[PDB]
C-alpha cells in the first residue's frame with residue numbers, strides 16, 4: 001500500500017496473510033472455514049495467518065491454519081487477469097472473535113464514488129522497495145469505468161473494476177495481491193493488477209466480487 005496509513009492492530013479483522021515461509025499475498029476471511037484471495041496468488045503449501053498485525057512478531061492474537069484445498073476460479077485466465085479469484089478452505093475452523101472476524105459478501109455491486117478500504121502488507125513505495133511489518137490501510141473511492149478505460153493497453157473486462165486515485169501517490173501495490181477492497185461492510189474487490197503503483201492517472205484494477213457471489217456460495221456449499 002502506497003500513501004496509506006498504519007491501520008492499527010486488528011482494526012481490519014477479516015484481513016489475512018498467506019504464508020509459504022514468508023508473507024506473499026493478502027486474502028479475506030468470509031467464514032470460519034474459507035478465505036477469498038486472488039487466483040494469481042495460487043501456490044502449493046499455503047498457511048493462512050489470521051489475526052495478524054506485525055507479521056514478523058507473535059503478538060498473541062494470530063491463528064495459523066494450513067489450507068486443506070485451494071480452488072482457483074474455473075475460468076481464471078492468467079494473461080488477462082480475467083476471473084482473478086481463488087477460494088482457500090482451512091484445515092480447521094478459525095476461532096472467531098473481535099480480532100478474527102468474517103466480512104460479508106455483497107448483495108449488489110457498489111456504485112462509483114463509494115468509499116472503500118484497501119489493506120495489506122505490500123510495497124509502500126511507488127519507486128523502490130519498502131515492505132512494512134504492520135498492516136497498512138488506504139481509503140479509496142470506486143471510480144467510473146469511463147474514468148479508467150484509457151488507463152491501460154491491456155484488456156479491462158467486466159469482471160474488473162477501478163478503485164483509487166487519478167492524482168497519484170495513493171494505491172495498492174505488489175504484495176497486496178489477493179487482499180480486500182471493502183465498501184460499506186461488503187467485500188467488493190480483490191487486489192489484482194495495475195501499471196506500477198501510485199502513478200498519475202493509472203489507478204488499480206480489482207476483481208469485481210459482486211459477479212462471483214453465486215460461484216462462491218455454491219463452491220462453499222459443496223466442499
Ligand SMILES: N=C(N)NCCC[C@@H](NS(=O)(=O)Cc1ccccc1)C(=O)NCC(=O)NCc1ccc(C(=N)N)cc1
Nearest residue numbers: 079080154171172173174177192193194195196197204205
Ligand atoms: N494483463 C495485464 N493487465 N497486464 C498488465 C499488468 C502487469 C503487472 N503490472 S506491473 O505492476 O507488474 C508493471 C507493469 C507491467 C506492464 C506495464 C506497465 C507496468 C501486474 O499488475 N501484475 C500482477 C501484479 O503484479 N499484481 C500486484 C499488484 C497489486 C496492486 C497494483 C496496483 N497498482 N493497484 C499493481 C499490482
Ligand SMILES: [Ca+2]
Nearest residue numbers: 054057058059
Ligand atoms: Ca504476528
